[PDB]
Amino acid sequence: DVQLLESGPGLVAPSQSLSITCTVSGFSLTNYGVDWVRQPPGKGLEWVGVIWSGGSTNYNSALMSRLSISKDNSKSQVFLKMNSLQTDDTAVYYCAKHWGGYYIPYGMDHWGQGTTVTVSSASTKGPSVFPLAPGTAALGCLVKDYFPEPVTVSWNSGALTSGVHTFPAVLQSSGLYSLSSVVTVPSSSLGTQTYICNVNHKPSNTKVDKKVEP
Amino acid sequence: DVQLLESGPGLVAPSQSLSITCTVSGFSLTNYGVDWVRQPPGKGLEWVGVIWSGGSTNYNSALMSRLSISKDNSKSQVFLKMNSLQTDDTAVYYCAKHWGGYYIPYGMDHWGQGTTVTVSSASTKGPSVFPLAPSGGTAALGCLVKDYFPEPVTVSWNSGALTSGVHTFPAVLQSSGLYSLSSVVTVPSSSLGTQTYICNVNHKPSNTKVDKKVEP
Amino acid sequence: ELVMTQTPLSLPVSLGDQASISCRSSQSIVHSNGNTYLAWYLQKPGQSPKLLIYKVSNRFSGVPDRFSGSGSGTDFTLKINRVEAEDLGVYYCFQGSHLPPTFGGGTKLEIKRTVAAPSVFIFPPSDEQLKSGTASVVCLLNNFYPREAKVQWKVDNALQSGNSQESVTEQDSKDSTYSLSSTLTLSKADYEKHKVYACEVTHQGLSSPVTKSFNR
Amino acid sequence: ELVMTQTPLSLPVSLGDQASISCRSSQSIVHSNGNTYLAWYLQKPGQSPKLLIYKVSNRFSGVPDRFSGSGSGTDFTLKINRVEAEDLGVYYCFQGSHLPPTFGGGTKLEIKRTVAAPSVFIFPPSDEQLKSGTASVVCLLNNFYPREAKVQWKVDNALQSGNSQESVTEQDSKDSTYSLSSTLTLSKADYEKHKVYACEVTHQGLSSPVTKSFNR
Ligand SMILES: Nc1nc2ccc(NC(=O)CCCC(=O)O)cc2[nH]1
Ligand SMILES: Nc1nc2ccc(NC(=O)CCCC(=O)O)cc2[nH]1
């Protein structure tokens, strides 16, 4: 079954290089082209380049003097590398598989989740996590003072999905991020049911499981 | 004679507010509308908003929830304010005077120089300036202006007396998060002995003024 | 090199009405082999883009028939009949006939539903945070429509300003509502000086402002 | 809200040839008062924008007759006859018929002149800088055409990589050339561990690659 996953370094310093690996499963790179597409925060989707089944490539005009896409068909891997990174290059980078057609694909049918790249001279910082204490009850976690994006948030290892709202993060004057994630639950549950938010910040390799009590 | 000049703070932190003043000369804000335009680094010009002669305003769709433009006709000043600053808002901000027409200007005839706003949590730093010490009958010399933040620096030679042959390069951001550039100038080799060359570097955001003699 | 122009930027539509999106190409995107490689993608909140239509008017497997593509040469249109909650997000066209291929700018589809008032909640700073030197006070507005909402903090009946920040979720795919948080950050020392902490909310769906509060 | 689309994004033109720029609007920019408020602006390197054309086809005072504006409804065109060095920079169209007014994305005029080889110079770190613990070596490529140039740093005849940054100037208004500076940065320690520093330059105007160097 078709899957694509991007693996990146999260934070690259200005002037330095990026290297992202797309690992692919359920089809052969010998038979399909893959595109790279990116999305600056708050902005539209930009086609970055492609590597055709046979190994030829093409590139974005704006980026082509700093871009190179290669692959290892046997390992089911495609690489994007880019040098001399600017602030501008901060974005979510997706790989997508080609679908349909002969020499020009009809579209891109499967996509990876995307990987987030911040171009910045600042250093990595994990989050401090604080509880937001509670026939309907709101509780949550405050996830504060972390750089760079993203953090992931789940409740009860992902068992608790419904009534969850994880907010867009805001950048604080400190140059650090902060968000809150909240969940609405039965007030009758608060005595019997336990509620833990699981926070994961992959750039600092930090993971915090916080118990939210009344 | 018509003039427009922007006055800004150069560096604002994320989430905080920007206040820019346009000071105007040679015409009356009572009789003319002024526009505010901005330009993100390497990117296109963006109309931000306007303040009409009678005092009414209109704003950009994307920014209008954070924008407000006002003015003091008596002082020939126009003010832009903008809250909740994003990284996105890093730009050169221009004011421009309206020209022509009845209730819609035919165009913008005079512009200020622009003022540079960087939105960042980092602190101000003034440059270190090193000499670049000196083709056939021609000599290149220059100055290396290093490790400063934010943009811009101004560079001149011989207090502005020396204009010809000058090339002041666009800055490059280094991995340290600090900027660097070099200004060069081509001079007669026969002058190196009798003429002195001092480069004048000004970094307003840090209030630093450095004069470096560039000797052979 | 081609430019794909998509309008409108933003498209508020009522549940069950039709949406029409335009995509214009600066030159013909008819290939020499005679096919026209124009596809449409939807990107839902927090999801990767998904292919809706390929070669102008061909639905991708699993795409409901409420969606259709038409057009030729330079002018193309995506029509969505009977818009549903789940159709929310940003639609993008994509030209593949010419190198280098290009996306349009995007059209954001906002769903228009009936008024719903927020459920309001206030949370005091956790003890754990207090013992670190900072006091974050959070106010939450849950599941409302329209997006326009007014949150004011008052401390001992003293209206606060410039010491708080808002975050709004993307519109909800099942109920077409928003949620919003406002955080009021205060040093421990400034927090302990005051007693009553209150978040006051104004909304279309509320008949008077709703306050939620606590005593420290 | 209207969208103004300008093509091409970049426009290489030979001295003395004609230049044609397109600007299209997503809807009519004909006002209900019957005028069409479309302006063209030129922004030259290191300058603020300047008004060339107003109301589709009217030259602003002091704008040469080589420049002309035409079009109607949604399709407009700027033509520049006998392009000159000084015409270089980014042109923008601007719609002022409908609120909010907007600029197009811009079209960059690049001048095509005859080949010109660079004059190459190298500069050693200054003593000052070395005694601060870092060594900047600079290589200068003066007044060349085309922009495409290859610069390689060699330290004791070993080719370097990842340890330098380039800055290129905007194309020159007087002779349509570029200048480039590659700066090679090193710890004093590393600098002093080596003897010969060379910059090797490849360019279409040179017969073979030119090297400039020094012994430390
Ligand atoms: N997801 C997609 N990635 C790409 C990359 C390139 C596409 N189109 C072309 O290469 C057109 C080539 C025209 C020709 O030379 O026949 C089309 C395309 N679609
Ligand atoms: N330099 C410029 N700033 C502006 C601001 C606003 C302009 N146009 C309008 O406001 C159009 C008004 C349409 C109407 O008559 O209602 C036009 C304009 N030109």
**Which string of DSSP letters, residue by residue, matches A27-57?**
S-TTT--EEEEEE-TTS--EEEEEE-TTS-E
D60/D16 same-domain check: yes
B89 phi, psi to nearest 5 deg: -85, -10
For residue B47, give the ligand nearest its CA. 2
Helix (H) or strand (E) holding B183: strand B179-188
* Whole-Å CA distances, B150 to A177, B12, B125, B175, D169: 22, 10, 7, 14, 20
CB D173: neighbour CB atoms within 10 A? 17
Identify the chains in contact with A, defined as 3+ C-beta pairs within 8 A.
B, C, D
A157 phi, psi to nearest 5 deg: 55, 15
C132/C70 same-domain check: no
D135/D195 same-domain check: yes
Contact D79, D67 (CB under 8 A): yes
Q: How far is the CA of D22 from the centre of ligand 2 (A)?
A: 22
Contact A132, A214 (CB under 8 A): no
D36/D85 same-domain check: yes
Which residue has tokens 């002969």?
A102
A184 phi, psi to nearest 5 deg: -100, 130
Q: How far apart are CA A61 and CA A48, in angstroms?
A: 9
CA angle C135, C136, C141 (to 5 degrees): 155
End-to-end CA distance of chain C: 63
* Whole-Å CA distances, C26 to C7, C20, C104: 14, 20, 11
How deeply is D132 buried, as exposed, middle or buried, from its count of CB atoms within 10 A (0-12, 13-18, 19+)? middle
Q: Fill in the amino acid letter for D83.
A: V
Q: How far apart are CA B21 and CA B81, in angstroms?
A: 9
CB distance from A88 to chain B under 8 Å? Answer: yes
Q: How far apart are CA B180 and CA C40, in angstroms?
A: 44
Question: Which residues, in sequence order, are CB contacts of C64 under 8 Å at separation 6+?
Answer: none
Q: Which two tokens stand for residue B104?
A: 């819609």
D98/D152 same-domain check: no
Q: Which two tokens stand for residue C190?
A: 């400034």
Q: Give the minimum alpha-carbon distance from D14 to chain B in angstroms, rounded to a whole number.
A: 24
D20/D40 same-domain check: yes
CB distance from B65 to chain D under 8 Å? Answer: no
Residues of chain A with CATH 2.60.40.10: 1-120, 124-214
Identify the chains in contact with C, defined as 3+ C-beta pairs within 8 A.
A, B, D
Q: Closest by alpha carbon to C13, among C115, C91, C106, C88?
A: C88
CB distance from A19 to chain D under 8 Å? Answer: no
B100 phi, psi to nearest 5 deg: 85, 165
Q: How far apart are CA D7 and CA D21, in angstroms?
A: 6
Q: Do A121 and B176 touch (CB under 8 A)?
A: yes
D88/D122 same-domain check: no
Q: How far is the CA of A104 from the centre of ligand 1 (A)?
A: 5
Q: Which two tokens stand for residue D28?
A: 């009519």
How deeply is B52 buried, as exposed, middle or buried, from its count of CB atoms within 10 A (0-12, 13-18, 19+)? middle
Contact B134, D121 (CB under 8 A): no
Q: Fill in the amino acid letter for C177.
A: T
Contact D155, D196 (CB under 8 A): yes
- In this structure, CATH architecture of domain B124-216: Sandwich (2.60)
Question: Which residues, in sequence order, are CB contacts of D6 under 8 Å at separation 6+?
Answer: D21, D22, D23, D24, D91, D92, D93, D104, D105, D106, D107
Q: Closest by alpha carbon to B126, among B91, B160, B153?
A: B153
- Highest CATH level, class, for A1-120: mainly beta
User: In which order are the strands placed within the sheet that holds B154-157?
Assistant: B154-157, B198-203, B208-213
> After what residues is chain C interrupted, C–N > 2.5 A?
none
* Whole-Å CA distances, C7 to A38, C22, C23, C24, C90: 21, 5, 7, 9, 12
Q: Fill in the amino acid letter for A118.
A: T
Helix (H) or strand (E) holding D130: helix D127-130
End-to-end CA distance of chain A: 44
Q: How far apart are CA D51 and CA B45, in angstroms?
A: 14
Experimental method: X-ray
* Whole-Å CA distances, B159 to B198, B201, B209, B211, B213: 8, 10, 12, 9, 12
In CATH, what number does A124-214 get?
Answer: 2.60.40.10
CB distance from A17 to chain D under 8 Å? Answer: yes
Q: How far apart are CA B2 and CA B25, in angstroms?
A: 6
Q: Give the minimum alpha-carbon distance from B66 to chain C in angstroms, rounded to a whole number.
A: 13
Residues of A in contact with C91 (CB under 8 A): none
Q: Closest by alpha carbon to B32, among B93, B105, B81?
A: B105
3 state SS of D146: coil
DSSP class of residue C172 equals P
CA angle B182, B186, B189 (to 5 degrees): 130
Q: How far apart are CA C149 and CA B100, in angstroms?
A: 40
- The helix/strand count (H/E) of chain B reads as 0, 19
**CATH value at residue D93:** 2.60.40.10
Q: How many residues are recorded in chain C?
A: 216
Structural domain including C32 reads 3-113
Q: Which two tokens stand for residue C204?
A: 């279309």
D7/D105 same-domain check: yes
Domain boundary among C82, C113, C144: C113
Question: Which residues, in sequence order, are CB contacts of D208 under 8 Å at separation 6+?
Answer: none
Question: Helix %, strand %, coil % for chain A, to 5?
Answer: 5, 50, 40
Question: Which residues, in sequence order, are CB contacts of C33 under 8 Å at separation 6+?
Answer: none
Question: Which residues, in sequence order, are CB contacts of A60 under 8 Å at separation 6+?
Answer: A46, A47, A48, A49, A67, C100
Resolution in Å equals 2.2
C105/C118 same-domain check: no
CB distance from D167 to chain A under 8 Å? Answer: no
Q: Fill in the amino acid letter for A27.
A: F
Contact C53, C39 (CB under 8 A): yes
CB D22: neighbour CB atoms within 10 A? 18
Residues of chain B with CATH 2.60.40.10: 1-120, 124-216
Residues of D in contact with C8 (CB under 8 A): 1
Q: Which string of b and e fits C25-57 if b means at least 16 CB within 10 Å? A: bbeebbeeeebbbbbbbbbbeeebbbbbbbbbb
Q: Do D7 and C3 touch (CB under 8 A)?
A: yes
Cis peptide bond prior to B150, omega within 30° of 0: yes
Q: How far apart are CA A180 and CA A141, in angstroms?
A: 6
Work out how many domains chain D is built from and give that number: 2
Contact B132, B144 (CB under 8 A): yes
